[PDB]
């Protein structure tokens, strides 16, 4: 049945206790340990998918397999299609087995 967030950690892929992103329309959820957070954040928390991993600027292009993402300055050449339905992946993944 329809839920707004995913059932698996976007970082490691395992289930369990997951913090949910507060960014409008973001379905991503994460283990606290995987984000190096000690406690669930107080109040509003937006996940790392929204900020460029190079510079912190707002992301415009998004890895489909992990929270790496890229602003307008850093997005060209950042992602390639993968064997899983052509879904885009960053350099952390083997595109044949992302």
């Amino acid at each position: 049945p329809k839920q707004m967030h995913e059932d698996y950690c976007f970082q490691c892929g395992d289930g369990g206790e997951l913090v949910m992103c507060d960014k409008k329309d973001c379905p991503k959820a994460y283990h606290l340990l995987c984000l190096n957070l000690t406690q669930p954040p107080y109040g509003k928390w937006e996940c790392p998918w929204h900020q460029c991993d190079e510079c912190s600027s707002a992301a415009v292009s998004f890895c489909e397999f992990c929270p790496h993402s890229f602003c307008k300055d850093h997005e060209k050449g950042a992602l390639v299609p993968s064997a899983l339905e052509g879904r885009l992946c960053c350099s952390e993944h083997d595109p044949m087995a992302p």
Binding site: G16, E17, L18, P41, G43
Partner: peptide, 6 residues
């Protein structure tokens, strides 16, 4: 921020 359990 909120949590869910799976």
């Amino acid at each position: 921020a909120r949590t869910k359990q799976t």
